[PDB]
Design a binder for this molecule. Structure first.
Ligand SMILES: *[C@@H]1O[C@H](CO)[C@@H](O)[C@H](O)[C@H]1NC(C)=O
Lengths: 100, 50, 49, 49
């Protein structure tokens, strides 16, 4: 048995069909066997019928074609951020300021 | 059931140009406003088409 | 594969490749099912490389 | 564009490696990807300096 992976859509999958799409929530998903985590929003991109999933410059999945529902539901466009701390020396005081 | 044709005229094939023909999508992935290079079967430009 | 694991008394993954226990979540494409019979210890001859 | 490299693996996404390869060798593959991207980051840092 040969289990090669191709860019063509998979005609066989495991029986793990449940739940429903959730919008505007940074949730995890395993669409078409590709694990990811991000929000599920809409976009103005026009998708040709043969196109299933898209890719960015870094070859990261940013689009999908949901079966039996047929919209975009973009892949992991979720935001992020960092944290910065502003405080004087410990000899003067101990108050801190958080920054993003 | 077929019928043979004997009215064919002898004429050697002619050759013309293929300036900007023979380009397609090598994959169905959606890429926008980017330049990508792929290794696939492609008809060369300015080839010699019959 | 859940029913096929008990349909036949075959050897349980004496091979290298895809994850055995995770095979439910594999959406593979374009399998080629080839069946043949061999003699003796020729099973070890059917290996990559 | 360096994120699209495979570094001798079968895929450029670590999730596919984790969900498609046995963890005893998936750990080695992830370590190889980690050290390749670390080498790329070190080259970028040296160029920046
Ligand atoms: C195409 O081939 C014919 C004969 O094979 C030749 O006469 C003609 O010059 C060729 N044209 C080009 C553009 O190569």
């Amino acid at each position: 048995l040969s289990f090669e992976l191709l860019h063509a859509p998979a005609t066989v999958c495991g029986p793990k069909k449940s739940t429903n799409l959730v919008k505007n929530k940074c949730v995890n998903f395993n669409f078409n066997g590709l694990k990811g985590t991000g929000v599920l929003t809409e976009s103005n991109k026009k998708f040709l019928p043969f196109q299933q999933f898209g890719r960015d410059i870094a070859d990261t999945t940013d689009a999908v074609r949901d079966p039996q529902t047929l919209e975009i539901l973009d892949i992991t466009p979720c935001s992020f951020g960092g944290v910065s701390v502003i405080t004087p020396g410990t000899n003067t005081s101990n108050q801190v300021a958080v920054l993003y | 059931q077929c019928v043979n044709l004997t009215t064919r005229t002898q004429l050697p094939p002619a050759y013309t140009n293929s300036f900007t023909r023979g380009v397609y999508y090598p994959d169905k992935v959606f890429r926008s406003s980017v330049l990508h290079s792929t290794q696939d079967l492609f008809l060369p430009f300015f080839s010699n088409v019959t | 594969y859940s029913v096929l694991y008990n349909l036949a008394p075959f050897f349980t993954f004496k091979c290298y490749g895809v994850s055995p226990t995770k095979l439910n979540d594999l959406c593979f494409t374009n399998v080629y099912a080839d069946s043949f019979v061999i003699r003796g210890d020729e099973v070890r001859q059917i290996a990559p490389g | 564009k360096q994120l699209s490299s495979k570094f001798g693996a079968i895929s450029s996404v670590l999730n596919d490696i984790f969900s498609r390869l046995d963890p005893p060798e998936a750990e080695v593959q992830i370590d190889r990807l980690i050290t390749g991207r670390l080498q790329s980051l070190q080259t970028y840092v040296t160029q920046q300096l």
